[PDB]
Each structure stands twice: as structure tokens, then as C-alpha cells.
Here is the input.
Amino acid sequence: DEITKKYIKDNIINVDDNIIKKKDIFKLKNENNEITECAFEYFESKKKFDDDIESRFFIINDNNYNENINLIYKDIKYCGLNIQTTGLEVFDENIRLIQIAVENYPVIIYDMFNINKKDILDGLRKVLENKNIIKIIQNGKFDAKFLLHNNFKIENIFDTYIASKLLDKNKNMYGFKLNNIVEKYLNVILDKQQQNSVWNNSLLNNNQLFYAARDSSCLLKLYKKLKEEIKKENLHIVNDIENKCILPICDMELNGIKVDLENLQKSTNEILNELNIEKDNLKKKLKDENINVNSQQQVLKALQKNNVRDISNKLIENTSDSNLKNFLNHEEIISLRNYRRLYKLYSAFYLKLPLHINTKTNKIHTTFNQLKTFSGRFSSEKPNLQQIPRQKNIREIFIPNDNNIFIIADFKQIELKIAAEITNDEIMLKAYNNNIDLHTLTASIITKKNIPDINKEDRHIAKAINFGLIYGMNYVNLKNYANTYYGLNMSLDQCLYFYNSFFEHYKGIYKWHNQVKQKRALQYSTLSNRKVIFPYFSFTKALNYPVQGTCADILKLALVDLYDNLKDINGKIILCVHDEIIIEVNKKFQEEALKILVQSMENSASYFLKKVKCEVSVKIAENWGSK
DNA sequence: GTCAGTCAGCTAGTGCTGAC
DNA sequence: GTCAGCACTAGCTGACTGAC
Here is the structure.
């Protein structure tokens, strides 16, 4: 229809009219700092949107490109960047539209499908790469990933999702989408009724482009309000850290971690054979060939039929992991426990990994999220890295890329050091000034032995108790904590003596406990001023939030510094799980990489913590499970 | 020849029970 | 706290009797 193809030359298909091609004379400065009059083509909705946000937009395709459009970018301080894509996955999908929003101008839409003169994107490249231009993005991780994968470089960034998430102080989990944020702050409904319209088509209809335009112009108003809201809340440090840490997360997701297919196959074969053998052994032991082991009720019934009892001559009524410890005086239960371990390991890692492995590159790629965790630490999904077993044999599957070598660095006692810093415990700080671990010190006070005489087992008990009592556990739960996660049986009187001895000397932590318990505050702040406001008081989380948040801040600062300091030797930041950072570097630059990693981690530690001095243990690893 | 009354397999949901 | 895996209990949906 002649109505519908009015603007086909610029790849626009009319749906319900509501589109006009209008030209007006603009006033722009020249490269010689001289105002120049230029005529531009911009489209407009025939029906004015009820809100005050802009809806004008240029479209820049192969034909319509005008060289003078690059002058908008000059002498700016913020610009709104949003990109539309055919699908979610970065590897299987391209970028359809790039949008730029410069204040008091329409939104410039670059149609990458109808762009072939590579000088077109030069202005986009320079506005993206400039470090003096605060690019505003919504959900910066997704857009940054798509841009980096296609040879673009984007340097500065300001994500409205991070600002909104931090400002809410973890009040609500859901929300924090573009429509919700704009409604909450600027009092406007974006009418996001586009139900994921088909983007693959070369031709794009009016509603899609206009909805994409209001998603870019609305970011500048959010920038203005969120900047002031953050400034009034003293959240600028953590916001800056998160914004600059967006890009390292994109690097980690893009590069991934390679899996040795041959070793994975060998381990899977061996583990399946071991599972079959143990299953057969249990089958003979349970004396029921038809028995299915996985049925929890059925194994309970079978063990009941076996009539094995307790030390109290009590029949088993539960196969809880700790209840198995109470019933260990038989070969049956040993076989059952071994089978449970093998089954969980097998069907949780070995049979699940092949789905995640991309046969195109034979690498595992993760989806890192940086503010879903309450404490602030990174959380992985799709493949859950923290759920990967941490035993030696399982991790060896992960190898570096061909012709490379891993560097692995991990903090030591970052929680305990941060606790010492915040609580200002004099004895801990005077201890760490002379390089003695707080596990060794805790063991020394517990066992009354001299420092050189401390063994490894005392260090283990210290490892238990320091974590136990530095997050405000009542001494009753110390027994459960030590037994369950470390296996050390303990008596209540021993727990009482340990509690008294621990809080008699480390005075600072006692003062911290007293203050936090007395105030019963509903709001807490970390050393990066990451504020959280709970619904109701909880002593455990009240004690746990500051140290964990500060540890997350230290890791994020380390990644931000590392991503800038590793660009010379072209090292990839691969993963960051727990207090551990992994970088892959070419085999020549091993020494330089080690120095860079250590320096970045130490500087990050020294930025927030001042009294103490963190240390990092770095080992060059052939495989992630190296020595 | 035909329709009730009762016998079920199937699918869901909840109950309950375990570890990464 | 998240997660799968299974009895058990229930309600439904066709087929095997039961009939005057």
C-alpha cells in the first residue's frame, strides 16, 4: 500500500500512521569552534505522547548518513546508550539498533543491518571510547557484552539499574525494570506493551523504533535524579565501583573457562563405573534386588528392616547427613553414605556439565550478576560456579586455553581482617602488624600454648571458632556449627570455655556485639557505604553485613584495577568466585601477570582497610585444581 | 441392546525427605 | 536458604460387570 511504504527508503514500515518525516534547521558547532547551520532529517510521532520525554529520532542507514551528525557528540558529559538485539544470547545474535541520546536533541538510531561504510560508526566509536563521557545504559551488563563482542570498546558507564538497586537499600527484590524505575522517579508510564516484536526483519515498524527511542531519552532524566539521590545518600563510592566493575564482569562472561573434553569423558566413565559398583554392593547389602536406592522412604524402610540400632539401641528414623554420623558402626551405612556422595557428585556435576558446554568453542560461559546477592558478592547462574565441587579431582577438568597458563590469587582471611579493621580490636591489629594469623592466635589463646607450638589441628579448631563467634552465634549453636561443617565433636562446657576465652581478650568484637545488639538498628552501612535496610532486626545479619559487603567491595575494586592493569599483556579475567580471582595470560608474560595481579589485589585491599595489611597467595596453575 | 455402579491407570499436588 | 526424587493421597476418565 502506498500509505504503508511512505518511508521504505529509510527502512520504515507504517502500521497505524503516527509517523511524520520532518526537516528543521539545527545549530551545531564546527570542528573549528564555529557555529554551522545544517539540515537534518528526523521522524516524529503524529500523535503527541502524553509525557514530556522526547520521541524524536534520527535514523542513520547506509544511504541517509550525513557526516555532520558527528558534531552532536562533541563537548558532552553524558549520553544515553541503549542497544536492541535479535535475541538474548550474545554468540547467536547480532546487534540490530544502537541508540544515542544527547540532551536537547533527538535520539540517533544507527541501523547496523543497513550500515556498511565503516566510517559511519567512527563517531559512535569515539563517543563510546571516551573516558570523559558518562555513557548511561540500562542493564549495562547485557549491552556492554554485546558491544564488546563486536569489537566496540566502551570505557565509562553509569547503569540506572545499579543506581536504583543500591538506592532502594534492598527493600524490594523484584522491580527495578526500566518502566518501573521511570514510573517511580519521573512520574511517567512508558507503555511497554511491545511483546518482544520480531526484530530480525530488515524493515522495522514505527512502534518498535519509537519505543526504542523513549527507552534512550528517558535515561538522561533518570541520570539527573539518581545522581542527586545517590549524593544525598553518600553512595557514590559503591556506585562508582559497581559501574566500573560492569566491564570486568562482561570480560569474565565472554571468555569463560575451557573444559578438557578428554579428561571430562574419562572422569565421567570412571565415576559412572564406581557408581554402578557401589550401587551393586548396596543392593547386595540391603538384601532387596528390586530396591531403588534413590527413594528416601525406601532406604529408610530398608535400613529399618536391617534392624541396625543406635548406641542407644534405637532404630534409625532419618538419613540426615548428621544422622548418618550417629549411625556409622556398620558396613551397610558406610556403603550407603558413599553411594549418596557419588550419586550427588555425579548427577550434579558430570551429567550436567555437557549441557552447558558450547560445542562451538568448547568453553563454559557463566551469567554473572553483581547485586542480586544481599551481601553484594557476585552470584553465578546458568552454570553455578560456586556449586561446582571444590574437591581436587573435579576441578582439574578446567584447563586454560591452548598455549596459555593460569594465574590464581586468593585473599587470606579477608573476613577476619575486615572485622579487625572495623571493630578496631587492638590485639588483632597488633597481631597482624607482626604477621601472625588470627587462626593461630585463636588457637594460642584456646590451648594456652606458645606461638611456635601451634599444630594444624588447633588451626582447624580456630578456623571453626573464629567464624563461629565473629558473626554472633550463641554458644549453643557453636556445637552444631563445628560438628556439621567441620566434624569436630564438642561438649557444651567446652563451648562455654571457648566462648569466654574468645571474648575475654578480643575486646573490640565484644564492644561491637554490645553496640549492635543495643541499638537494634534497622539500617547498616559497610566501608564502601553500601547501605541495607531490613524489615526487622536480626543480630546474625546485622553482624554479617558489614564484613561481607566490604569483602565484596574489595573484590570489585580489585577487578576494576586489574582490568586496567592487565591490558598490556592481553590477559583475560576468567572467573571470580569466593575470595579468589583467576586471570589467563600468555606463557611469555607469566611473571608480569603475577606482579600485576598481586599489585592490584594489594592496592584494592589498602584502599578501604588501613590498619591491617592483606596478603595474597599466588600460584601459577596448569589446571584450576593445581597445587 | 442399552445405561448405571463400580473396578481401575494417570497426572498432579502435596508431604516428606535428603545434600551441593 | 535451593534443588530433585519419590510414596501417598486424591480426583478424574473408560472399561468390566449388573440388570430387568
Notes: The two ends of chain A are 71 Å apart (CA to CA). The longest strand of chain A covers residues 20-29. Chain A is about 45% helix and 15% strand. Residues 28 and 34 of chain A are 8 Å apart (CA to CA).
